[PDB]
Amino acid sequence: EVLITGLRTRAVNVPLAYPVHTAVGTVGTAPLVLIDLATSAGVVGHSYLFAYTPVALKSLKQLLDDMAAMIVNEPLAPVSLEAMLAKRFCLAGYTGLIRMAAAGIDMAAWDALGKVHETPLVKLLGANARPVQAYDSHSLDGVKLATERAVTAAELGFRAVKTKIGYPALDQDLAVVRSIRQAVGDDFGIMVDYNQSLDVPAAIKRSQALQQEGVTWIEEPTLQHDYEGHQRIQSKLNVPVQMGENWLGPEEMFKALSIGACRLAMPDAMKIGGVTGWIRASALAQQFGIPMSSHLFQEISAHLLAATPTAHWLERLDLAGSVIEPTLTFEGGNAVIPDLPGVGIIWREKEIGKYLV
């Protein structure tokens, strides 16, 4: 039996070429927890967590470190390890930061398991590597920069981009989208993301005007937990409502899809519960007829999407590029999984120093 022998985490706050502006606030740098999971077979599993705000960063690192003792000497069997953690956090609430930390462990464990068998994760999941179409993910950038980032993305061979909207006025949402559209042409996806900023009637009004414009999908139009409200917005639309980045575990995804919140889903490898939760999520999207994309975590999402029966898009937003070797590449807009064991995440150890919190 291969055993887990140790856990080490490191908190960084890493710079973004382009700060992520949203209609509810800006993420100017990336607060990350980098996770190393040591094993008795001598390999080291790697993953990372995104804490969104520096306010949650130290708390997340502390929680993982305190969780070290419950995983050390457990078998490196991510599925059994997830059940053990779901039980240990039964009382406290297996959600939120605690679930995110459990996901970080899970992703490092599956990386480790791929390394034990010297096989890329995608193959360990029983699937073939294949290129996965990717959209370049931008932010609430203003007409000028939004249009430039779009052109550049199109120059690099991306077939779609996402821009984050929710400007003070609807006309401003539309001017950004029209300006991207003039510059990329009609054969190009423009996904838009409201980041939860509208109430249901505002969302219906804005969304029907954006749909007239031709957008590829409308993402998180209202409060993320409000699945009934998403359903109400979706009911007034032909264009699909998109959500899922905020589902904490496949049980949240199940509740949203059960009441018809959306016609597309994009779980987040961390929030959905890592590789173990992702695989469950994929089973749900398939039965519910829901094309499934990724949210962040582009390195592991390239593997995961290749094992996903309704795989739709990979989101390109390179949060961890400063501290992770660029072994994932893009050819003609598609993510290409590297020929490395597990996930293909290699730390740029020389760089992690600049960013330690």
Q: What is the 3-state secondary structure (H, E, C) of 175-223?
A: HHHHHHHHHHCCCCEEEEECCCCCCHHHHHHHHHHHHHHCCCEEECCCC
Around Cβ 70, how many Cβ atoms within 10 Å?
A: 15
Nearest-approach distance from CB 341 to ligand CFI, in angstroms: 28
Determine phi and psi for 120, rounding to 5 degrees. Answer: -60, 145
Among 193, 252, 268, 299, binds Mg ion (CB under 5 A): 193
Which residues 6+ apart lie within 8 Å of 150 measured at CB?
138, 161, 163, 180, 183, 184, 190
Beta carbons of 180 and 204 less than 8 angstroms apart: no
- Is residue 219 marked as binding? yes
- The answer to whether 229 contacts a copy of itself (rule: CB under 8 A) is yes
- Is residue 193 marked as binding? yes
Nearest-approach distance from CB 241 to a copy of itself, in angstroms: 10
295 carries an active-site annotation? yes
- Is residue 331 marked as binding? no
Judged by CB under 8 A, the chain residues 196 through 215 that form the site for a copy of itself are 196, 199-201, 204-205, 208
Pick between residue 201 and residue 326 the one whose CB is nearest to a copy of itself.
Answer: 201
Pick between residue 196 and residue 282 the one whose CB is nearest to ligand CFI.
Answer: 196
252 residue type, one letter: E
Of the candidates 300, 244, 247, which has an alpha carbon nearest to the alpha carbon of residue 48?
300
Question: Rounded distance, CA 196 to CA 174, Å?
Answer: 18
# of chain residues touching ligand CFI (CB under 6 A): 9
Judged by CB under 8 A, the chain residues 234 through 293 that form the site for a copy of itself are 236, 238, 240, 246, 248-251, 254-255, 263-264, 271, 275-276, 279-280, 282-284, 286-291
Burial class (CB in 10 A: 0-12, 13-18, 19+), 192: buried
Evaluate the CA torsion angle 283, 286, 289, 291 in order and state its sign.
Answer: positive
- The answer to whether 245 contacts ligand CFI (rule: CB under 6 A) is yes
- Is residue 65 marked as binding? no
Nearest-approach distance from CB 70 to ligand CFI, in angstroms: 18
Burial class (CB in 10 A: 0-12, 13-18, 19+), 180: buried
Angle of the 298-306 helix axis to the 274-288 helix axis, nearest 10: 50
Nearest-approach distance from CB 27 to ligand CFI, in angstroms: 4
Question: Rounded distance, CA 189 to CA 161, Å?
Answer: 6
DSSP for 95-154, please give it.
SHHHHHHHHHHHHHHHHHHHHHTTSBHHHHTT-----EEEEEE--S-HHHHHHHHHHHHH
Catalytic residue among 21, 162, 230, 295: 295
Judged by CB under 8 A, the chain residues 286 through 305 that form the site for a copy of itself are 286-291
Catalytic residue among 115, 162, 164, 312: 164
Give the per-residue contact string, 215-254, with Mg ion (x = CB under 5 A; - = no): ------------------------------x---------
- The answer to whether 90 contacts ligand CFI (rule: CB under 6 A) is no
- Token pair, residue 55, equals 């306010």
Around Cβ 205, how many Cβ atoms within 10 Å?
A: 13
Judged by CB under 6 A, the chain residues 286 through 315 that form the site for ligand CFI are 295-296
Question: Rounded distance, CA 257 to CA 55, Å?
Answer: 31
61 carries an active-site annotation? no
# of chain residues touching a copy of itself (CB under 8 A): 97
- The answer to whether 216 contacts ligand CFI (rule: CB under 6 A) is no
Nearest-approach distance from CB 319 to ligand CFI, in angstroms: 7
CA dihedral 114→118→119→125, nearest 10 degrees, is -40
- The answer to whether 22 contacts ligand CFI (rule: CB under 6 A) is yes
User: Which residues here bind ligand CFI, judged by CB under 6 A?
Assistant: 20, 22, 27, 91, 193, 195, 245, 295-296
- Residues forming the annotated binding site? 193, 219, 245, 315
- Residues forming the annotated binding site for substrate? 315
Q: Which residues are catalytic?
A: 164, 295
User: Which residues here bind Mg ion, judged by CB under 5 A?
Assistant: 193, 245
- Residues forming the annotated binding site for Mg(2+)? 193, 219, 245
